[PDB]
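Troubleshooting log. The previous run stalled partway through. Resubmitting the same six chains, unchanged.
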Amino acid sequence: NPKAFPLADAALTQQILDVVQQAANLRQLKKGANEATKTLNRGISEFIIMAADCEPIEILLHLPLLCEDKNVPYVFVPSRVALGRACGVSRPVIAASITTNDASAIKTQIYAVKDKIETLL
Amino acid sequence: DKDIIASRLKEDVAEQQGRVFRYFGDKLLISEAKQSFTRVGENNLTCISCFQPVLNKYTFEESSNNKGRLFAYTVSKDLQLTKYDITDFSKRPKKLKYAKGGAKYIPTSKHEYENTTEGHYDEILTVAASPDGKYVVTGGRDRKLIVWSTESLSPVKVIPTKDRRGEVLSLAFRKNSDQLYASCADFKIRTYSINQFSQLEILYGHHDIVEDISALAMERCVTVGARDRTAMLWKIPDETRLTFRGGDEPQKLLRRWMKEPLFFCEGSIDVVSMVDDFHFITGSDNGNICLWSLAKKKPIFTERIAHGILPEPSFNDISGETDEELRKRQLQGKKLLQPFWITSLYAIPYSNVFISGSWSGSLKVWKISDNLRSFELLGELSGAKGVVTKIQVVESGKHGKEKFRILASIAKEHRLGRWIANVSGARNGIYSAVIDQ
Amino acid sequence: GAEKKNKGRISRYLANKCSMASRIDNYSEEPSNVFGSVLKKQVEQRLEFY
Amino acid sequence: SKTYSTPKRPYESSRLDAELKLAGEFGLKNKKEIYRISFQLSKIRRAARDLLTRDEKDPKRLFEGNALIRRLVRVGVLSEDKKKLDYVLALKVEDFLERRLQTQVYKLGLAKSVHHARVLITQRHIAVGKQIVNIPSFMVRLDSEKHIDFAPTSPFGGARPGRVARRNAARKAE
Amino acid sequence: AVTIRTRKVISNPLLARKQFVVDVLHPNRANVSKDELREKLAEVYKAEKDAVSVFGFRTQFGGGK
RNA sequence: UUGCCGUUGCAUUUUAUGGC
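Second attempt completed without errors. Output:
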């Protein structure tokens, strides 16, 4: 029973982070832990992703208490550098979020991802 | 007799026919080279491209220009490129001509239809050298192409990419010619001609950011985009495309193995080289390295995790706790082990062996087999600690005995982003290995 | 009052490093001092940047 | 030809508010655009009703329903999971006209409003890969949804700036 | 700078011709100026500039090819 | 063989390496 329990396996990892890159190219993503919690307690968040190998794990483990209280799915991913390459940014981002927007052309893939990870959790 | 007809066919008719002919699979002894690091005073060296004068091109009139010396060109993220003398295999490379740009080359109009300033203004990413030996192209983060003359490194012509994110990532000449193909990050592919200093064609059609690219003497060009698990062979004169996708699923591979083993899906295709005009190789993100034919959408041979798996974060810097059982259980077992990436891959053109590289330090030189459908680990060169951003091979000798020179550019940052993950003892340099026979 | 240009960017750096340390020592089960020490060294290097 | 058809009554309150909402939401010109898309929706699901009312395992129903769902997923109005024939019966006009190039480049970004999207792609700026499209009602296929960008011979891409910009550069550099 | 590119080339010694389809690609110019095209095509082949002929051009939409 | 700091070399180019 570790502290990063809903850790996604390989194929679900690849589909959630190509949805990440589509969102980053569609200007619908928030990069980083404190902007993630700011958009989370603002409310606009379809789902949030953390990285399960940051060198202190608690600096993004503070996000569960917000997200499963405000009823939004959350998923750990086994590589911060892969999530950085997904977000399309130089330094490794460890906590990304997808904002909510019904004027974005990845709504179908976002909802498929969200249904898969609610079944995962 | 047979020796004369063999040498006379292997001189030209194989190299224009297309199949692999320069077989030195077991002729090349594997691991007894003179491995030489060379320090270099830049930050985060980005790309290498060596130019060798071809001996007696296709009829005669040997090569272009000194008369018969090899060369190399390197380029860093400090906005400078350095010409290298490389030709003396007995000793180290020699810095010959520096050429550096800086913040004074910022265009003041910023209107993007002209970047006629000659230097650079950030993070040059790729140099290629012309086969005619009188031009060297370069391109990087400042949406530009620059041609320099070959021995004074003075800028001759400035070719803007003419798009707001018209962001070049890798250049590639096609051999013994003057058309080059430039990858970009606005998903297109540029085709330039050097001798006219011109842009022939903008071939679109790639879906995501097209990251790397190679070409051979036949006028076809292979490209690889990052995050859609694909590889496009552009046949230019028929203006058509061939779309090779990956698609190894871990559930089917686990079902194939469990009858008798930790692997995972493909993240990204990264680097390429064409072995011939009918096969090629892709070194992907997740450790897969794949030999593809031109006949099948599936790859022929997808070798698994290339350079091993990264060592996990230790039991004192994972969770900030005190007790060792808690800071070891937060590693979650092997479930967050991540593979070494294939950072750069390079095949000797029309041959058997190709060279990979990662930040696992070790250039693993494989060898393909004679039935052209499998490859095995020939050798491993443990000489270059650092990321291996591109690998070049320059050779010398006769028809019989060949003395090859593996050059590789070694840095402490990947050539696109920073992304330093567990790098230890890795200095900006050029890794030389004079392999023989 | 607490966390006492060049006089303000150091306070912002100290602010989000303080939030980082707060996350560590609250969501841990029982915390350590090594991350507080390397946080102190990071912010001291950011101060000696001046 | 006669694509568009007049509905069963054209002067009615609920129909009037339907055309008002759809026109002002997807940025449309007149009632003929809603009538064309509504007509071809009605035609394809009237064809789907017959394939439903005949039995299963008939070769007609099998590969003609596979043909219809292949054509509809190629246009992109049907998601990848609901690949059976009665979701074509459950289709709607909104996610059928959402795939026109106007709405699609507004969803892709790069336009800041639906009406600005329409006026720029009729001012000849957006090209699907290589082909400059100067018409809104395109119904862009699913495969070429990511090839939308400003055309290279247009000054929102990387061409020469427009005649307004260079004329103002002239008589502001004088 | 323009390029030309021929495809679908079939020999035809029933008239001793070679007939083909011609794709000219000009990135910014209007069109490829048939006389200059004809001398360029006779240069890339081995022809006369009198024994080479092109007729059925059409510039595709949006310009460029 | 380096923008800066730690090493060889022979009878001071040369000799390998690791901290930013």
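Takeaways: Residues 10-174 of chain D form one domain. Residues 31-53 of chain D form the longest helix (23 residues).
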